[PDB]
Amino acid sequence: VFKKVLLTGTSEESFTAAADDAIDRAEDTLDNVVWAEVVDQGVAIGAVRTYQTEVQVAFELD
Amino acid sequence: VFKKVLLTGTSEESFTAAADDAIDRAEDTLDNVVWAEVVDQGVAIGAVRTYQTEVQVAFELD
Amino acid sequence: VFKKVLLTGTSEESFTAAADDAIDRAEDTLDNVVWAEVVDQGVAIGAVRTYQTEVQVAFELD
Amino acid sequence: VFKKVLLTGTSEESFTAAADDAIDRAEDTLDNVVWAEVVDQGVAIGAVRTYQTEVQVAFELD
Amino acid sequence: VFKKVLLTGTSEESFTAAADDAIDRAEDTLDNVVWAEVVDQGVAIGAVRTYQTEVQVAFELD
Amino acid sequence: VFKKVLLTGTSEESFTAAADDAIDRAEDTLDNVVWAEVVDQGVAIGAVRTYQTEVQVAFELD
Amino acid sequence: VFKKVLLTGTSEESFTAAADDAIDRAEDTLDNVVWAEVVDQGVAIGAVRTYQTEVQVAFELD
Amino acid sequence: VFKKVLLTGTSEESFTAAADDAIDRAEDTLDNVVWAEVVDQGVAIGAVRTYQTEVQVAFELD
Amino acid sequence: VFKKVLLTGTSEESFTAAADDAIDRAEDTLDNVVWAEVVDQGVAIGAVRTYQTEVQVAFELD
Amino acid sequence: VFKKVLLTGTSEESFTAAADDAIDRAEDTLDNVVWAEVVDQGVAIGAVRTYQTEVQVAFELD
Amino acid sequence: VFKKVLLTGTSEESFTAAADDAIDRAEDTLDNVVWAEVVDQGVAIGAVRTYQTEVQVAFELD
Amino acid sequence: VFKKVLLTGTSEESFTAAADDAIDRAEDTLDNVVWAEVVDQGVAIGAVRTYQTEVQVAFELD
Ligand SMILES: Cc1cc2nc3c(=O)[nH]c(=O)nc-3n(CCCNC(=O)O)c2cc1C
Ligand SMILES: Cc1cc2nc3c(=O)[nH]c(=O)nc-3n(CCCNC(=O)O)c2cc1C
Ligand SMILES: Cc1cc2nc3c(=O)[nH]c(=O)nc-3n(CCCNC(=O)O)c2cc1C
Ligand SMILES: Cc1cc2nc3c(=O)[nH]c(=O)nc-3n(CCCNC(=O)O)c2cc1C
Ligand SMILES: Cc1cc2nc3c(=O)[nH]c(=O)nc-3n(CCCNC(=O)O)c2cc1C
Ligand SMILES: Cc1cc2nc3c(=O)[nH]c(=O)nc-3n(CCCNC(=O)O)c2cc1C
Ligand SMILES: Cc1cc2nc3c(=O)[nH]c(=O)nc-3n(CCCNC(=O)O)c2cc1C
Ligand SMILES: Cc1cc2nc3c(=O)[nH]c(=O)nc-3n(CCCNC(=O)O)c2cc1C
Ligand SMILES: Cc1cc2nc3c(=O)[nH]c(=O)nc-3n(CCCNC(=O)O)c2cc1C
Ligand SMILES: Cc1cc2nc3c(=O)[nH]c(=O)nc-3n(CCCNC(=O)O)c2cc1C
Ligand SMILES: Cc1cc2nc3c(=O)[nH]c(=O)nc-3n(CCCNC(=O)O)c2cc1C
Ligand SMILES: Cc1cc2nc3c(=O)[nH]c(=O)nc-3n(CCCNC(=O)O)c2cc1C
Ligand SMILES: [Cl-]
Ligand SMILES: [Cl-]
Ligand SMILES: [Cl-]
Ligand SMILES: [Cl-]
Ligand SMILES: [Mg+2]
Ligand SMILES: [Mg+2]
Ligand SMILES: [Mg+2]
Ligand SMILES: [Mg+2]
Ligand SMILES: [Mg+2]
Ligand SMILES: [Mg+2]
Ligand SMILES: [Mg+2]
Ligand SMILES: [Mg+2]
Ligand SMILES: [Mg+2]
Ligand SMILES: [Mg+2]
Ligand SMILES: [Mg+2]
Ligand SMILES: [Mg+2]
Ligand code: NA
Ligand code: NA
Ligand code: NA
Ligand code: NA
Ligand code: NA
Ligand code: NA
Ligand code: NA
Ligand code: NA
Ligand code: NA
Ligand code: NA
Ligand code: NA
Ligand code: NA
Ligand code: NA
Ligand code: NA
Ligand code: NA
Ligand code: NA
């Protein structure tokens, strides 16, 4: 059985690095992370631009 | 990194109060709740009407 | 077996009351109404504002 | 011909009043506003809760 | 309040049995499981075919 | 001209048999049923599991 | 309250005339038809081409 | 950079001519109109039928 | 088994004729074309307007 | 690089077997088939019922 | 109240830089730009590749 | 007439380079490639991360 968590990664560099920010957090706290699907992307526009990529990160349960 | 939980709040008064029911539960159990996005709304029709609002409630991890 | 009818309720007060307007019409004419799912919401803007909530109203056949 | 603007209204009371906040802004600046369609709803969760309703507000050109 | 987890069940027999695989895992670890909604279905095609059914499994919190 | 009714069939065996439950009800009450399109699938989880398949069932008018 | 029926009109001439085929059927059998929304379009390709336009046709109840 | 405006053209003849009604309005008021994407189609059913086609009309900024 | 190809037909006359442009190309090169489903429509706006209709054209394999 | 073909499998038994009908056709004609994603399901209702499952079948190019 | 404009940024380097191209144009002409949501991405394939990212860019009115 | 193929490009560097991986494969085997539309993005998480971008790559037939 796989389960997915819905995470939004951030980066001041690019949408790819914001996806990796989420995946790095998932791998810090979960075992058997196996893939991620991008569900939304956006940019927070303040003092700097922060690219955000929301991913469903799938991991295998057990 | 933000994470979202998918909660359905209920109310016998209105869709806004059913969104707040979910958010109040998230704030009981999670720190750093920052926003909610409505994903579905419906009404359970029994002895009384129960308005339901499903929200993805985002909180900042750490 | 359940069947759904696609109704748009109206109210000059709120989206929740326009959902209830549709459900009240369904319960006038159908037996065994059991739930409603909101599919669209809008506002007709004329002499007054009329909030509209479109619902699929499910009822059990028999 | 109708044209739509994509506005997000806010309210600390309810999703219906946040839709009306957007419509009131459209009617301040545009003539012949004729309807609004809700496209998204959410809640900003800070010191207080601010309900937000995003609407495409249609007005007739001429 | 209900909460949903996003699980992908697997089966080498059918999409219905892969939905039940997810639900059986949810019932192993959560109380008050009340319904599941199918969100995606697919087949992993290797040495054998593994049917997969992804479900949001809802359970009542408390 | 074809018209569609939105029915949810149920079965304690499988999603295919819950689609057939809806179609059997449509054929009991309507003439010239010609096809069905699956629009949603889910499982009610109580004393037993009840698989549900919602279909738009098309029939030719006349 | 408005209710919608889901009809597929046909024409061997064009998608506009297949929408009108559905609307003409609705007006034959229902009072107070007020608008139609196109939901799908397609072409049946046999001895001749038959353009099809599926519409939700709204009528006011009473 | 391109920008899109969301316009609904009307015609008593056909959906193609209602798309052209919107595009003709865009070309009256904007320079460098380059394409349009159909996003919705419908028919207003009153004394006469008025076909409507909503388009995002893209134009190049500068 | 049916297979679909994703084609965009063009016409300087109408969206129906741009669907037929795609279907005519499919019938030039494939046997047993049986139906087409419209998936997108748009207009290229240059020296002239070119209406485009994208269709999934289904044909039976064998 | 993976490429997907859009196939509709059929079966008089079940939606799972109609997915396998498509996959069996893909494996007859393509090398390195690796997965399939269900995109639509329906039932053709004639002398018998024919369950149909449309899948995007992915295969690795080379 | 926030309003969004629908802009397509371009870059010959990457999808992130094409999002920034749109945002830079919005900040040239609008005050109080606060966020952008990616709605579509594509690549124009001519003499060179031009990555395009379409964003709804939100700004606060006043 | 344009036709689209549905390809998933891969890269261990970024989503933009995985889109270019698909486009480079299309240009190896097809003439008159003219644009690509991103339809899905994801990351395969194994020994290394492999970013994947699925594109519909359009080419002009003739
Ligand atoms: C993708 C994205 C979506 C957002 N949507 C909203 C929104 O819907 N409402 C709101 O008050 N603030 C929002 N915000 C917050 C704006 C806060 N201010 C800022 O970024 O300068 C959003 C931010 C991001 C990055
Ligand atoms: C939004 C909403 C959706 C529902 N969908 C279903 C459903 O798909 N199937 C079912 O057996 N019961 C359902 N139910 C449960 C009906 C249970 N009875 C009742 O509300 O009187 C649903 C209830 C709600 C509020
Ligand atoms: C949600 C909503 C959607 C509408 N869409 C349309 C529409 O697409 N076209 C049209 O002529 N009139 C429309 N109308 C009717 C405008 C009629 N005039 C008015 O409300 O002052 C719509 C009305 C509502 C409430
Ligand atoms: C509907 C809604 C969506 C939002 N989405 C985002 C978002 O995607 N990213 C972000 O940094 N901040 C967001 N925000 C901003 C969070 C800012 N903080 C706060 O509300 O306490 C969003 C706010 C709202 C109301
Ligand atoms: C529904 C489904 C979707 C998949 N999507 C992908 C995918 O997008 N990319 C990838 O490298 N592998 C995938 N895979 C993994 C292919 C691994 N190999 C195999 O199944 O023989 C997917 C598998 C399944 C069952
Ligand atoms: C597909 C499906 C969707 C449902 N959605 C809801 C729902 O949104 N809210 C609710 O109160 N009950 C629901 N229910 C009813 C739960 C009633 N209890 C039970 O099944 O043990 C749903 C049931 C089904 C089968
Ligand atoms: C829009 C459209 C969709 C169709 N989809 C299907 C379909 O999914 N399966 C099937 O067996 N036949 C279909 N058909 C029926 C093909 C019957 N034969 C024919 O048109 O020569 C469809 C027909 C139309 C017009
Ligand atoms: C596509 C379309 C959508 C519409 N949707 C609505 C609607 O949602 N609510 C409403 O009061 N009136 C509507 N109307 C207005 C009906 C006004 N009366 C009429 O057309 O005779 C709509 C009109 C059109 C053309
Ligand atoms: C439906 C449609 C969509 C289009 N989308 C795009 C697009 O997203 N980006 C771009 O550079 N050019 C586009 N184009 C090309 C504009 C080329 N110039 C012209 O039509 O005068 C599109 C054209 C059409 C017909
Ligand atoms: C899923 C499915 C969708 C279909 N959609 C259509 C359709 O949109 N129009 C049409 O003329 N025939 C259709 N058909 C064909 C009906 C042909 N007759 C029959 O099945 O007895 C469809 C068939 C299937 C299985
Ligand atoms: C994302 C994207 C979408 C496009 N869609 C279309 C389209 O639908 N029709 C058309 O004639 N040209 C198009 N074009 C224009 C092709 C113009 N030629 C070229 O890019 O070499 C599109 C271009 C882009 C970048
Ligand atoms: C976007 C993406 C989607 C995937 N979806 C699935 C999936 O739905 N089921 C499965 O068994 N494997 C999958 N996989 C395969 C996991 C194989 N293992 C791995 O990547 O370590 C997917 C892979 C990718 C990149
Ligand atoms: Cl989710
Ligand atoms: Cl419906
Ligand atoms: Cl828009
Ligand atoms: Cl496709
Ligand atoms: Mg930096
Ligand atoms: Mg009360
Ligand atoms: Mg009042
Ligand atoms: Mg207050
Ligand atoms: Mg076995
Ligand atoms: Mg049994
Ligand atoms: Mg003729
Ligand atoms: Mg006339
Ligand atoms: Mg001409
Ligand atoms: Mg049999
Ligand atoms: Mg360069
Ligand atoms: Mg590297
Ligand atoms: Na989730
Ligand atoms: Na988002
Ligand atoms: Na729901
Ligand atoms: Na219906
Ligand atoms: Na509507
Ligand atoms: Na939003
Ligand atoms: Na999936
Ligand atoms: Na459902
Ligand atoms: Na259809
Ligand atoms: Na807009
Ligand atoms: Na519309
Ligand atoms: Na398109
Ligand atoms: Na289909
Ligand atoms: Na686009
Ligand atoms: Na395809
Ligand atoms: Na995918």
Author numbering:
A (entry chain A), B (entry chain A), C (entry chain A), D (entry chain A), E (entry chain A), F (entry chain A), ...: 2 to 63
Paper text:
Dodecin from Halobacterium salinarum is a hollow spherical dodecameric protein, which binds oxidized flavins with high affinity, whereas flavin reduction induces the dissociation of the holoprotein. Herein we use the riboflavin binding protein dodecin as a redox-sensitive probe to study ET processes through DNA monolayers. To study ET, dodecin can be reconstituted on flavin-terminated ds-DNA adsorbed on gold electrodes. If ET through DNA is possible, applying a negative potential will result in flavin reduction and subsequent release of apododecin.
Prior to adsorption of apododecin tE, a non-binding dodecin variant dA was added as a negative control to show that apododecin tE is bound specifically to the flavins.5b To minimize the ET distance between the redox-active isoalloxazine subunit of flavin and DNA, different flavin–DNA ligands comprising only the first five bases at the 5′ end (oligo 5, O5) and flavins of different lengths (CofCn) were synthesized. Dodecin was reconstituted with these ligands and X-ray structures were measured. In Figure 1 A the structures of the flavin–DNA ligands CofCn O5 with a hexyl, butyl, propyl, and ethyl group (n=6, 4, 3, 2) at the N(10) of the isoalloxazine moiety are shown. For all the flavin–DNA ligands, electron density can be traced for the isoalloxazine moiety (and the first two CH2 groups). For the CofC2_O5 ligand further electron density indicates binding between apoprotein and linker plus the first two DNA bases. As shown by superposition of the ligands in Figure 1 B, the (rather deep) position of the isoalloxazine ring of CofC2_O5 in the binding pocket is similar to that of lumiflavin, while all the other flavin–DNA hybrid ligands superimpose with riboflavin. For electrochemical measurements a ligand with n=3, bound only by its (oxidized) isoalloxazine moiety, appeared to be the best compromise between high affinity binding and short ET distance. Efficient ET could be observed even for larger distances between isoalloxazine and “molecular wires”, when the flavoenzyme glucose oxidase was reconstituted on gold electrodes, but using molecules other than DNA (e.g. single-walled carbon nanotubes) as the molecular wire.5f, 9 In the X-ray structures there was no electron density for most of the linker between DNA and flavin indicating that (also after protein reconstitution) different orientations of DNA and redox-center relative to each other are possible.
